[PDB]
Design a protein around this ligand. Structure first.
Ligand SMILES: [Ca+2]
Ligand SMILES: [Cl-]
Ligand SMILES: [Fe+3]
Lengths: 109, 99, 110
């Protein structure tokens, strides 16, 4: 897919490359960047301060993730372990129905 | 002096002292037909984030509030369908709703 | 940081450039490059990134909620106060036991 819009409106402000990619400010408070690739090199940090950020594609995080609010995953997640309320899911047990202990989490069957 | 681009309505992109790049607007739309790469030690979103395809995380993840998912495959084992060796040497049934 | 990359101005470049050396540059072959110490984006309503893949080389912190439509692969441990899996609390889940009764809730590993 190639998307290099060229329309301009009265009052637009921008940075424009002759190949067609650009950064544009236009009416109704909109900033629109249209290009092949965006690279950000920020020595210290990037902050995105907005009520909602949406990524339409895949996201890869090469170090860690922290989330303060609730997370909703619509498809399966995979992890080597999930520590849930201090308890390893991989190795958790239960008090069994005869008052002993079960073995650890096992493969479905 | 600063460098920047400014719209009459008030939104702008500015470069200013101490290596700051500042974008201030109502909406930001980034269209990148191939990819976006953000090379920085820490990225912080102050609001919600929605990812419409998949997520991959190499490092540890810390969720401070509950997560929800149709299944979590933990060390190769379905959480939704997992069982245990029972306390009498048989097998339990699969994960069931809390009592 | 990834260094040793081309940074010299080419014919046709368009940008904004601060005296200190940070910059936003558009260069050949459809490339946009932001180089600085800090990036601060503020969008009063929303930000949308429409791209097949977004990569963050460092840590990410999300201060409100996260939603993911596709599959998620976590290569290291995750931690949460609870995981509601197919409608069932992981923290509090039970099983039918091996003797016709029911087990207690999830307990710490041995
Ligand atoms: Ca039993
Ligand atoms: Cl049992
Ligand atoms: Fe269990």
């Amino acid at each position: 897919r190639r998307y290099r819009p060229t329309n301009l409106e009265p009052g637009d402000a921008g940075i424009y490359h002759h190949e067609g990619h650009r950064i544009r400010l236009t009416k109704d408070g909109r900033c629109i960047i249209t290009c092949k690739t965006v690279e950000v090199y920020a020595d210290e940090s990037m902050t995105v301060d907005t009520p909602r950020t949406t990524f339409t594609g895949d996201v890869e995080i090469q170090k860690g993730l922290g989330v303060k609010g609730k997370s909703q995953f619509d498809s399966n997640i995979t992890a080597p372990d999930a520590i849930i309320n201090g308890k390893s899911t991989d190795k958790h047990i239960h008090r069994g129905d005869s008052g002993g202990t079960t073995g650890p989490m096992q493969l479905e069957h």
